[PDB]
């Protein structure tokens, strides 16, 4: 493991071996590499185009250094994110419904793009986003939900923060987020921002020891189930990767108006999610439904995508109360109540 | 000028416009860009593959920020198989019939650098810019130690050393002569550079600059076989191929041109001047021949070769006048001693 040799290899557009990539990431995350070289390597990786072995190597390096809690039966709804449309944080809302039927270990962070990270939307809801591992295990047991803040559960990652921020461009670390859940959740709905990443990440995921992880790419170009058109999907399990194409209509809905699903801040996301839970926003509620339906299919709790949607319908009607119990046990309900009062409670 | 927007553009493999690259280069050289971002930018440029505009832009940036003197009428020559540095010797011959503003640095590669050879010869390679033009006026020759005439490059040194790889800055040296010499003979290390650097040179305002790539891989005129060349002027770019045999000579065995020390390179050049090393003398003449064509002092390479033979017979004395005015002639006399 010699950083200069690795950089030369990358400059020459040669893919790294898994062990090679793992060792590289470890050194980087542990802060053993000069910032100048970390920057060069991240830029080189992206321009070469990261490979399956590199994603796998980096993913394992992060997991190895992460703080862990035990909940493999949990499901997560993390997505890679991406520089595109600023849609309402549906993965946070979907996570609330899911907690009604399965333990949820939500892995998230804050965002640079204004305030669009799941951590930001939950904080706006009144959730206390910093949960020490002992209490985290407690919360999931009592409410089937817990938020695992990346900046807290991946402490070594602060060693790459300055470079990542200064760079100001997406790198390999941005697509590894959902692959490094601190609770080691074996079930997951992972959103991706492109058709190629769909292929790259599913093959990477196949070697990452999941029970069932479904990756999706929403059509306009979203890392969520498409509200307007088709959703390209890949269902990976211990037996392979299933290709699945899908349209919003296969849920039983009519194309959802993108304008009604757009937000410009964490609180607007919070307000919209609550409005849907209150039955005041049919479109946002439908967006939550389709995303949750696929998540249920991942849990094998529904044999069909429309059955998932239908079941997700029962769930949303009991979601605000669930959100209320979640926040009260780990957060400030006063805030939640003002947000409720914000979109007419 | 937005650095982040520039980076995103390179990351997407889109070439920059000339003005864009020039402002980017200026900011970097001025040290106004965080090292993390300078590193990112150099790597992105390298992997995308630098374009003509990016070369032009960066070269104009270094020119603007360099310590300058003005001898546009002067000519500069080319410059690691370890072959003797004939571009330095050639610079000496040329100074007999035209002002020479030799731009160079020390080599990393064990003293093959023009600055190393000049030093071993007795020349004081560190020339203050004020004294620079006076030396050219009085002796028709002056060496411009790059490292000192491009002081602002200190602002990219740490990134360059830490990266350890070749970047856009490694091919700009000959396009940044501090004396603004309009005539130049510059070697490239690959045929792909011939095409790109010539198109870049075409827009760098030279009267006449000839780019050469010599077999088996040298940034000079080939002494063993072919030399792929491009002649750039206000009138366009001409493709020209040439074989050492055209100069009317037999291919020189490269083994007889390889040196492994600055002093050894100095000794071989002097022996050539003294008529004691015909193979080296030949290597010097064929290079001097193309430069002579660049100045339009001859109308053909053979003529340039024949002309160069007259010049070499007078180069030891010329070297002595040059050094006596800037350097130590006792060291030159030490080197002369048969050797």
Report resolution (Å) to 1 decimal: 2.0
Say which CATH architecture domain B72-145+178-339 belongs to.
3-Layer(aba) Sandwich (3.40)
Cβ within 8 Å, pair A169-B36 = no
DSSP label at A255?
A: -
Chain A residues near any Cβ of chain B (below 8 Å)? 4, 7-8, 11, 13, 34-37, 39-40, 42-44, 46-48, 162-163, 166-169
Strand spans (E) along chain A: 75-76, 104-108, 145-149, 187-191, 212-218, 230-237, 240-247
Handedness of CA A59, A61, A62, A63 (dihedral sign): positive
At residue A343's C-alpha, the angle toward residues A340 and A345, to 5°, is 45
Q: How many contacts, defined by CB atoms under 8 Å, are there between A and B?
A: 66
* Token pair for B290: 């193309």
Cβ within 8 Å, pair A48-B43 = no
Q: Where do the CATH 1.20.970.10 domains begin and end in chain A? A: 1-70+150-181
Q: Homologous superfamily of A1-70+150-181 in CATH?
A: Transferase, Pyrimidine Nucleoside Phosphorylase; Chain C (1.20.970.10)
Nearest to B54 by CA among B160, B235, B265, B203: B203
B13: which chain A residues are within 8 Å (Cβ-Cβ)?
A: 47
Residue with tokens 């088996």: B216
Cβ within 8 Å, pair A36-B163 = yes
Helices (H), A219-261: none
φ, ψ dihedrals at B239, nearest 5°: -90, 135
Nearest beta carbon to residue B43 from set A13, A44, A166? A44
Rounded CA-CA distance B228/B225 in Å is 10
Question: How far is C-alpha A302 from the geometric centre of its chain's CA atoms?
Answer: 22
Q: Residue B264: beta bridge partners?
A: none
Cβ within 8 Å, pair A39-B36 = yes
- Contact assessment for residue A97 and residue A312, using Cβ atoms and an 8 Å cutoff: yes
Rounded CA-CA distance B196/B211 in Å is 11
Rounded CA-CA distance B273/B280 in Å is 9
Nearest to B179 by CA among B295, B99, B71: B71
Cβ within 8 Å, pair B36-A34 = no
3-state secondary structure of A43: helix
A29 min Cα distance to partner chain B (Å): 16
Tell me the three-class secondary structure of chain B, residue by residue. Answer: CCHHHHHHHHHCCCCCCHHHHHHHHHHHHCCCCCHHHHHHHHHHHHHHCCCHHHHHHHHHHHHHHCCCCCCCCCEECCCCCCECCHHHHHHHHHCCCCCEEEEECCCCCCCCCHHHHHHHHCECCCCCHHHHHHHHHHHCEEEEEHHHHCHHHHHHHHHHHHHCCCCHHHHCHHHCCCCCCCEEEEECCCHHHHHHHHHHHCCCCCCEEEEEEECCCECCCCCCCEEEEEEEECCEEEEEEEEHHHHCCCCCCHHHCECCCHHHHHHHHHHHHHCCCHHHHHHHHHHHHHHHHHCCCCCCHHHHHHHHHHHHCCHHHHHHHHHHHCECHHHHHHHHCCC
Q: Which CATH class is domain A72-149+182-343?
A: alpha beta
Q: Which CATH class is domain B1-70+146-177?
A: mainly alpha
Return the number of other C-beta atoms located less than 10 Å from residue B333's C-beta.
Answer: 12
DSSP label at A164?
A: H
Task: Tell me if A113 is assigned to a ligand binding site.
Answer: yes
Compute chain A's Rg from CA coordinates. 19
Q: Where do the CATH 3.40.1030.10 domains begin and end in chain A? A: 72-149+182-343
Question: How long, in residues, is chain B?
Answer: 339
Cβ within 8 Å, pair B163-A34 = no
A46: which chain B residues are within 8 Å (Cβ-Cβ)?
A: 11
Rounded CA-CA distance B15/B9 in Å is 8
- Nearest residue of A to residue B163 by CA position? A37
A169 min Cα distance to partner chain B (Å): 7
Q: Indicate the annotated binding residues of B for Mg(2+).
A: 87, 219-220
DSSP label at A188?
A: E
Q: Where do the CATH 1.20.970.10 domains begin and end in chain B? A: 1-70+146-177
Mutation target to probe the A interface, by most A beta carbons within 10 A, among B39, B50, B158, B170 is B39
3-state secondary structure of A147: strand
Rounded CA-CA distance A54/A56 in Å is 5
Nearest to A110 by CA among A222, A253, A238, A266: A266
Any residues with CB less than 8 A from the CB of A49 and at least 6 apart, and which? Answer: none
Nearest to A21 by CA among A51, A63, A48, A64: A51
Q: Where do the CATH 3.40.1030.10 domains begin and end in chain B? A: 72-145+178-339
Q: Indicate the annotated binding residues of B for 5-phospho-alpha-D-ribose 1-diphosphate.
A: 77-79, 83, 85-88, 102-110, 114
**C-alpha separations of B115 from A8, B112, B288 in Å:** 29, 8, 19
- Contact assessment for residue A158 and residue A65, using Cβ atoms and an 8 Å cutoff: no
* Token pair for A319: 């979601």
Q: Residue B327: beta bridge partners?
A: B123
**A98 Rama class: left (phi>0) / alpha (psi -120 to 50) / beta:** alpha
Any residues with CB less than 8 A from the CB of A53 and at least 6 apart, and which? Answer: A15, A16, A17, A18, A21
Beta strands at A75-76 and A187-191: parallel, antiparallel or unpaired: parallel
Nearest beta carbon to residue B40 from set A7, A34, A167? A167
**C-alpha separations of B171 from A242, A251, A269, B284 in Å:** 50, 59, 52, 23
Cβ within 8 Å, pair B36-A162 = yes
Return the number of other C-beta atoms located less than 10 Å from residue A91's C-beta.
Answer: 27
> Cis ω on the peptide bond leading into residue A119 (within 30° of 0)?
no
Q: Residue B213: beta bridge partners?
A: B228
- Nearest residue of B to residue A170 by CA position? B8
Any residues with CB less than 8 A from the CB of B163 and at least 6 apart, and which? Answer: A7, A36, A37, A40, B39, B42, B43
A9: which chain B residues are within 8 Å (Cβ-Cβ)?
A: none
A169: which chain B residues are within 8 Å (Cβ-Cβ)?
A: 4, 7-8, 11, 40
Mutation target to probe the B interface, by most B beta carbons within 10 A, among A4, A47, A162, A171 is A47
Rounded CA-CA distance B222/B47 in Å is 30
Rounded CA-CA distance A343/A14 in Å is 53
Nearest beta carbon to residue A43 from set B13, B34, B43? B43
A37: which chain B residues are within 8 Å (Cβ-Cβ)?
A: 39, 162-163
Rounded CA-CA distance B81/B84 in Å is 9
């Amino acid at each position: 493991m010699n950083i200069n040799e690795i950089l030369k290899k990358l400059i020459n557009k040669s893919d790294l071996e898994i062990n090679e990539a793992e060792e590289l990431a470890k050194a980087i995350i542990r802060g053993e590499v000069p910032e100048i070289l970390v920057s060069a390597i991240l830029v080189a990786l992206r321009m070469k185009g990261e490979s399956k072995n590199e994603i796998v190597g980096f993913a394992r390096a992060m997991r190895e250094l992460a703080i862990k809690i035990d909940v493999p039966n949990a499901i997560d709804t993390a997505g890679t994110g991406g520089d595109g449309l600023g849609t309402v944080n549906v993965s946070t809302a979907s996570a609330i419904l899911l907690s009604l039927v399965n333990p949820v270990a939500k892995h998230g962070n804050r965002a640079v793009s204004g305030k669009s990270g799941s951590a930001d939307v939950l904080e706006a809801l009144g959730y206390n986003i910093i949960v020490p591992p002992e209490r985290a295990k407690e919360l999931v047991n009592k409410t089937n939900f817990v938020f695992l803040f990346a900046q807290y559960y991946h402490p070594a990652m602060k060693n790459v923060a300055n470079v990542r921020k200064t760079l100001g461009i997406r790198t390999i670390f941005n697509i590894l987020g959902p692959l490094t859940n601190p609770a080691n959740a074996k079930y997951q709905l992972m959103g991706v921002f492109s058709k190629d990443h769909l292929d790259l990440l599913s093959k990477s995921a196949y070697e990452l020891d999941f029970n069932k992880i479904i990756l999706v790419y929403g059509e306009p170009g979203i890392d969520e189930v498409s509200p307007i058109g088709n959703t390209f999907m890949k269902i990976v399990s211990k037996r392979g990767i299933e290709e699945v194409k899908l349209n919003v209509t296969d849920f039983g809905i009519s194309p959802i108006p993108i304008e009604k699903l757009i937000v410009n801040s964490a609180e607007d996301s919070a307000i919209k999610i609550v409005r849907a839970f209150l039955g005041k926003d049919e479109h946002v509620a439908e967006f939550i439904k389709i995303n949750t339906a696929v998540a249920l299919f991942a849990l094998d709790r529904v044999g069909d995508f429309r059955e998932g949607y239908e079941y997700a319908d029962h769930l949303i009607e009991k979601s605000l109360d669930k959100l209320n119990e979640i926040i009260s046990m780990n957060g400030d309900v006063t805030k939640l109540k003002t947000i409720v009062v914000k979109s007419s409670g």
